[PDB]
Amino acid sequence: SMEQVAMELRLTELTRLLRSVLDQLQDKDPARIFAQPVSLKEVPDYLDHIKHPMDFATMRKRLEAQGYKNLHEFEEDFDLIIDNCMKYNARDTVFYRAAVRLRDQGGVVLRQARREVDSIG
Incomplete structure (x- = not known):
C-alpha cells in the first residue's frame, strides 16, 4: 500500500536523524571505551553482573x-x-x-x- 510506503519513508528518515545523533554521541567518547561489547573472554563474569x-x-x-x-x-x-x-x-x-x-x-x-523528532514528525 501507499500508506505502508509512507510509514517506511518516515522510518528511513528517523534512521537518518538517529545516525547523525549516534555519530555525535560517539564523538563524546574519544577514548572508545564504549565502542565495542565488553569481551566475555576478558571479563568472564560480566553477564552475572549486567x-x-x-x-x-x-x-x-x-x-x-x-x-x-x-x-x-x-x-x-x-x-x-x-x-x-x-x-x-x-x-x-x-x-x-x-x-x-x-x-x-x-x-x-x-x-x-527530541525537539527535531517532534518538529519534523
Whole structure:
C-alpha cells in the first residue's frame, strides 16, 4: 500500500536523524571505551553482573537494520551503555568517569534530537 510506503519513508528518515545523533554521541567518547561489547573472554563474569549489555557497535547494527522505531528506543540503548558501566565499575575508575562525561555531554545532543523528532514528525 501507499500508506505502508509512507510509514517506511518516515522510518528511513528517523534512521537518518538517529545516525547523525549516534555519530555525535560517539564523538563524546574519544577514548572508545564504549565502542565495542565488553569481551566475555576478558571479563568472564560480566553477564552475572549486567543483564542487558550494550555498546555503540551493537547500536549501529540495530540502526542500520532500521531497528529503532522511535527516539525512546534509541535512548534506552544509550542509557544502558552508561548505566551498565556505572554499576560494574567503581566511582574512582576511568570507566565510570568516562560514562559520567558521556551522559553529561550526550544530554545536550539528545535534548535537541527530541525537539527535531517532534518538529519534523
